Amino acid sequence: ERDALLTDLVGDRAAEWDTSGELPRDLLVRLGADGLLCAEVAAEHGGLGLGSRENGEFTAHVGSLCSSLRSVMTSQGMAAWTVQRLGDAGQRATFLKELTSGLAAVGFSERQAGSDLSAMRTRVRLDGDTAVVDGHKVWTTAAAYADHLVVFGLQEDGSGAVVVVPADTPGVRVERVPKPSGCRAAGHADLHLDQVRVPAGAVLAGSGASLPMLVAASLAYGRKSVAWGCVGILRACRTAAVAHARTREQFGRPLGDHQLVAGHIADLWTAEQIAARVCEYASDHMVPATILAKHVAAERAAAGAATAAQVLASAGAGHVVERAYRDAKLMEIIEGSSEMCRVMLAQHALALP
């Protein structure tokens, strides 16, 4: 059991969560403690130890129900991955167990550093037994719910470091984004870090490599998660469109019998299949396949959502299709925008024999 559980946990409440702009805190801790939202974490740390396909299809299913909830899973998973990819033995042992005993967020983006991550100015300064982080992050997903804030920044010598900061450490202020356009219940919030003091142990080991590499390591997850999340959006759109198409009648027959509508259904099904295949391929493998999966799944999900909205018409004008339309648009922008994905994939192709 896993998807069935989420179908009923969600069980017809996504619309209200979306319009109210918030997810139940109790649900997230419950899922976190169950190891879900963190499924790929090794069993040694109390994780479920799921592979990329298993966790991926699970992420896709949650995405098909509520993308705000799905976004929390991506943030959770990304934080966990970042710590187990950079942290040491003691660091991974401490943080990973907490992320699977019931919340974290990952903030690297800044007002002046969006697509250009190397433009962030937040600084982390090791000073004896203590680290001092000072900066500001924007649009941090799930930050309004997090206990831990995984913050990226520049050291001093070897620029680029990552620090796990307790949400309640004096000097930190998490200001929720007022009116987010999509994934409205994901708890987006800007982070204000005014001279925050934390143990030197909070700074993950390997926090000495360049700005890229790090971030690139964390973005690998997230891009994979967002890609599967988009497969979920396509699932919800395809199923809602087909349901409307074989039940709604106009001009004396089910909409599905009108070839133009059939065409939309075919394109929705095809989009869903394409996104799944690319996600599966990336999950098997690596960096380019993941960028590719996120890119295609996102663009196809955005197109699919518009197509599904067309099919449902006034009935979809709340709604899974309504939310998919707004949510998918955002997916084309985050975790490496469509434009950045094109520049990166272009660079990849231009380096092939």
Site string for ligand FAD, 298-317 (x = CB under 6 A): --------------------
Cβ neighbours, 10 Å, residue 211:
19
The reply on whether position 343 binds ligand FAD by CB under 6 A is: yes
Span near ligand FAD by CB under 6 A; candidates 48-56, 80-88, 101-109, 316-324: 101-109
Look at residues 281, 182, 225 and name the one whose alpha carbon lies nearest to residue 82.
225
Instruction: Kindly identify the residues of this chain, within the stretch 132-161, that bind ligand FAD according to CB under 6 A.
Output: 139-141
Strand 161-166 to strand 172-176: parallel, antiparallel, or no bridges (unpaired)? unpaired
Look at residues 224, 117, 115 and name the one whose alpha carbon lies nearest to residue 162.
117
Distance CA 182, CA 328 (A): 8
Site string for ligand FAD, 58-97 (x = CB under 6 A): -----------------x----------------------
106 annotated to bind ligand: yes
Distance CA 37, CA 56 (A): 11
In the complex, minimum distance from the CB of residue 199 to ligand FAD, in angstroms, rounded to a whole number = 23
Cβ neighbours, 10 Å, residue 239:
15
265 annotated to bind ligand: no
Exposed / middle / buried, residue 252 (Cβ in 10 Å: 0-12, 13-18, 19+): exposed
In the complex, minimum distance from the CB of residue 326 to ligand FAD, in angstroms, rounded to a whole number = 10
Considering only residues 154, 197, 337, 348, which one is a binding residue for ligand FAD as defined by CB under 6 A?
A: 337
Span near ligand FAD by CB under 6 A; candidates 6-14, 36-44, 278-286, 327-335: 327-335
Total chain residues near ligand FAD (CB under 6 A): 20
Cα 158 to Cα 123, 219, 324: the distances in Å are 12, 20, 42
Which stretches of the chain bind ligand FAD, using CB under 6 A? 75, 106-109, 114-115, 139-141, 182-183, 188, 330, 333-334, 337, 339-340, 343
